[PDB]
Amino acid sequence: DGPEKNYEKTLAILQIESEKAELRLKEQEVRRLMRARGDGPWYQFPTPEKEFIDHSPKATPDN
Amino acid sequence: GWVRPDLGQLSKVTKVKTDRPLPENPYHSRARPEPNPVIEGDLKPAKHGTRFFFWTV
């Protein structure tokens, strides 16, 4: 075919793998921040359920 | 003219009124912290698939 094919295919492969590197490191820092502080969707550890509390009138006022 | 209540008349709710207001925020509850926001987006394919080690797709 020629040299242009190899050259430009190499360029494509290079941008692909560079972007992958970028995203892997980004994922590392993202997981770090999400775990150190639960601001994000991940590492949101469970809490007690709210809907199983009874809010009705009790037997004593100062419940 | 005081008539004795019958069997189950003192065992039910009775709908009082008063000049008082409602208590605003009983339990002296503090403000609730705001939940973490939801990521708004129509999700797309993963960028270059799995960034695993060397798998292409």
Curated annotation (Swiss-Prot), chain A:
Name of the featured protein: NADH dehydrogenase [ubiquinone] 1 beta subcomplex subunit 5, mitochondrial
Family under the similarity heading: Belongs to the complex I NDUFB5 subunit family.
Instruction: Determine the domain of life of the protein's source.
Output: Eukaryota
Task performed by this protein: Accessory subunit of the mitochondrial membrane respiratory chain NADH dehydrogenase (Complex I), that is believed not to be involved in catalysis. Complex I functions in the transfer of electrons from NADH to the respiratory chain. The immediate electron acceptor for the enzyme is believed to be ubiquinone.
In which compartments does the protein localize?
A: Mitochondrion inner membrane
Gene designation:
Ndufb5
Residue span relative to the full protein: 127 to 189 of 189
According to the record's subunit comment, the protein's assembly and interactions are:
Complex I is composed of 45 different subunits.
Curated annotation (Swiss-Prot), chain B:
In the record's own words, the domains note is: Contains four C-X9-C motifs that are predicted to form a helix-coil-helix structure, permitting the formation of intramolecular disulfide bonds.
Keywords assigned by UniProt, alphabetized: Disulfide bond, Electron transport, Membrane, Mitochondrion, Mitochondrion inner membrane, Repeat, Respiratory chain, Transport
Q: Give Gene Ontology CC terms.
A: mitochondrial inner membrane; mitochondrial intermembrane space; mitochondrion; respiratory chain complex I
Free-text function comment from the UniProt entry: Accessory subunit of the mitochondrial membrane respiratory chain NADH dehydrogenase (Complex I), that is believed not to be involved in catalysis. Complex I functions in the transfer of electrons from NADH to the respiratory chain. The immediate electron acceptor for the enzyme is believed to be ubiquinone.
What species does this protein belong to?
Mus musculus (Mouse)
Transport recorded as keyword: yes
Query: One GO MF term, please?
Result: protein-containing complex binding
Primary localization class, coarse: mitochondrion
Gene that codes for this?
A: Ndufa8
Q: Name one GO biological process term.
A: proton motive force-driven mitochondrial ATP synthesis
Q: What is this protein called?
A: NADH dehydrogenase [ubiquinone] 1 alpha subcomplex subunit 8
Family from the record = Belongs to the complex I NDUFA8 subunit family.
- Which compartment or compartments is the protein found in? Mitochondrion inner membrane; Mitochondrion intermembrane space; Mitochondrion
Subunit structure as annotated in this protein's UniProt entry: Complex I is composed of 45 different subunits.
